């Protein structure tokens, strides 16, 4: 499948001076697997997915160092940022990095990603060519001068092509199924509405992963209204899709459900 690795690095400073908080999270196939946070008494990288527990202390040693180096790198690059945008200190500031790579079905490297946001807005990004920087706004240009000067684009182009792909291979070996899915559980509920009308809410429960399409009708989604996919709390997920109907006209509607863990598309109608 479309296998991926990502590390989401965040640096926060708040008023009350001192030092920015550095969180770094890592994801394989969109599932959190490692985690670092400067707030802890003993700030280590900890394993987040039982299959990571098969890694020697020296792995946790070496990445705790590596992360302590970004806590460093981030502390600075935030200070330059306050510089560029000429901002008055003792306020909240946020700096964010998304790093990582995409793997084909042949374990081919498809694309790499390296980006940065400041104040939650895109600041600078490596293009897909892996040679040039897209820089939105003037302060981002300053940075783009430096990084072209310092061959920074070769430095990452190396990480994404070499070590990313390499460690992704291995994390996938470690995670053999540990591709497990959970089929969705669907009922259709009946909640009446004023003036000879009713609502048709179609719930899907217990599922994993979150990829879900809810379709009721034939083939009309115009009037319908649905909700943000949401975690159950246990691993699994939820969402629902409603539509307004005239009272007693209910029978013609079929709710269609599409999930990867299914044998086939499931459709159901209200049964009182």
């Amino acid at each position: 499948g479309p296998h991926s690795m990502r590390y989401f690095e965040t640096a926060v400073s708040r008023p009350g001076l001192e030092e920015p908080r550095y969180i770094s999270v890592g994801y394989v196939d969109n599932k959190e697997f490692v985690r670092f946070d400067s707030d802890a008494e003993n700030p280590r990288y900890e394993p987040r997915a039982p299959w990571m527990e098969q890694e020697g202390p020296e792995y946790w040693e070496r990445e705790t160092q590596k992360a302590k180096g970004q806590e460093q790198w981030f502390r600075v690059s935030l200070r330059n940022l306050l510089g560029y945008y000429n901002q008055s200190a003792g306020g909240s500031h946020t700096l964010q990095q998304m790093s990582g790579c995409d793997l084909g079905s042949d374990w081919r490297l498809l694309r790499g990603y390296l980006q940065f946001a400041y104040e939650g807005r895109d600041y600078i990004a490596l293009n897909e060519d892996l040679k040039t920087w897209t820089a939105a706004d003037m302060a981002a240009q300053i940075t783009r001068r430096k990084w072209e000067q310092s061959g920074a684009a070769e430095h990452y182009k190396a990480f994404l092509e070499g070590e990313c792909v390499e460690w992704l291979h291995r994390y996938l070996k470690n995670g053999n199924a540990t591709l497990r899915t959970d089929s969705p559980k669907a009922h259709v509920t009946h909640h009446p509405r004023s003036k000879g009308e009713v609502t048709l809410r179609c719930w899907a429960l217990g599922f994993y992963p979150a990829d879900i399409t809810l379709t009721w009708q034939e083939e009309l989604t115009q009037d319908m209204e649905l909700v943000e996919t949401r975690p159950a709390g246990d691993g699994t997920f939820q969402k629902w899709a409603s539509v307004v109907v005239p009272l007693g006209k209910e029978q013609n509607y079929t709710c269609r459900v599409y999930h990867e863990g299914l044998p086939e598309p499931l459709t159901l109608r209200w049964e009182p």
Partner: peptide, 9 residues
């Protein structure tokens, strides 16, 4: 493993 950053912003 994580990416190691290079020159600062």
């Amino acid at each position: 493993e994580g990416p190691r950053n290079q020159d600062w912003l």
